Protein backbone atom coordinates (compact mmCIF):
# COMPACT_ATOMS: atom_id res chain seq x y z
CA UNK A 1 0.00 0.00 0.00
CA UNK A 2 1.56 3.29 -1.21
CA UNK A 3 0.50 6.94 -0.71
CA UNK A 4 -0.95 9.19 -3.45
CA UNK A 5 0.91 12.00 -1.63
CA UNK A 6 4.59 11.30 -0.85
CA UNK A 7 7.57 13.35 0.39
CA UNK A 8 9.36 12.54 -2.89
CA UNK A 9 6.79 14.23 -5.21
CA UNK A 10 6.80 17.98 -5.99
CA UNK A 11 4.36 20.66 -4.77
CA UNK A 12 3.24 21.32 -8.38
CA UNK A 13 2.24 17.65 -8.79
CA UNK A 14 0.43 17.57 -5.40
CA UNK A 15 -1.64 20.69 -6.25
CA UNK A 16 -2.70 19.15 -9.61
CA UNK A 17 -3.60 15.88 -7.82
CA UNK A 18 -6.11 17.52 -5.42
CA UNK A 19 -7.04 21.28 -5.40
CA UNK A 20 -7.76 20.97 -1.64
CA UNK A 21 -4.00 20.50 -1.14
CA UNK A 22 -3.58 24.26 -1.78
CA UNK A 23 -5.71 25.06 1.29
CA UNK A 24 -3.77 22.60 3.47
CA UNK A 25 -0.38 23.94 2.29
CA UNK A 26 -1.38 27.61 2.78
CA UNK A 27 -2.70 26.70 6.26
CA UNK A 28 0.70 25.06 6.93
CA UNK A 29 2.59 28.25 5.84
CA UNK A 30 3.56 26.39 2.62
CA UNK A 31 1.47 28.78 0.49
CA UNK A 32 4.61 30.75 -0.45
CA UNK A 33 5.62 27.78 -2.69
CA UNK A 34 4.24 29.68 -5.70
CA UNK A 35 6.34 32.80 -5.02
CA UNK A 36 9.64 31.13 -3.94
CA UNK A 37 9.31 28.86 -7.01
CA UNK A 38 9.01 25.69 -4.89
CA UNK A 39 6.55 24.27 -7.47
CA UNK A 40 9.36 22.10 -8.93
CA UNK A 41 10.51 21.18 -5.40
CA UNK A 42 9.66 18.02 -3.37
CA UNK A 43 7.20 18.24 -0.44
CA UNK A 44 9.84 17.29 2.18
CA UNK A 45 12.29 19.95 0.89
CA UNK A 46 9.78 22.81 1.28
CA UNK A 47 8.60 21.34 4.60
CA UNK A 48 12.03 21.47 6.32
CA UNK A 49 12.58 24.91 4.69
CA UNK A 50 9.52 26.12 6.65
CA UNK A 51 10.51 24.10 9.76
CA UNK A 52 7.77 21.45 9.42
CA UNK A 53 7.69 17.63 9.35
CA UNK A 54 6.51 16.19 6.02
CA UNK A 55 4.94 13.22 7.89
CA UNK A 56 2.13 15.36 9.40
CA UNK A 57 1.64 17.04 5.99
CA UNK A 58 1.30 13.73 4.09
CA UNK A 59 -1.15 12.60 6.81
CA UNK A 60 -3.68 15.38 6.09
CA UNK A 61 -3.03 15.43 2.30
CA UNK A 62 -3.67 11.66 1.95
CA UNK A 63 -6.87 12.24 3.96
CA UNK A 64 -7.98 14.45 1.01
CA UNK A 65 -7.62 11.33 -1.18
CA UNK A 66 -9.68 9.08 1.13
CA UNK A 67 -12.43 11.72 1.72
CA UNK A 68 -14.13 9.37 4.26
CA UNK A 69 -13.20 11.56 7.27
CA UNK A 70 -15.87 14.24 7.93
CA UNK A 71 -14.70 17.41 9.76
CA UNK A 72 -18.28 17.98 11.02
CA UNK A 73 -20.77 15.48 12.52
At the topology level, CATH places domain 1-73 in: SP0561-like (1.10.3910)
3-state secondary structure of 42: strand
Give the H/E segment covering residue 2: none
**Which of 34, 16, 28, 32 lies closest to 60, judged by CA?**
28
Instruction: Please count the residues of the chain.
Output: 73
Q: How distant, in Å, are the alpha carbons of 40, 59, 72 from that of 68?
A: 30, 14, 12
Experiment used for this model: NMR
Q: Give the domain ranges of the chain.
A: 1-73
As a whole number of angstroms, the distance between CA 8 and CA 70 comes to 28
6 contacts 43 by C-beta, under 8 angstroms:
yes
Bridge partner residues of 48 (DSSP): none
Amino acid sequence: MTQKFTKDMTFAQALQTHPGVAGVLRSYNLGCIGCMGAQNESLEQGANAHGLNVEDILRDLNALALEHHHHHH
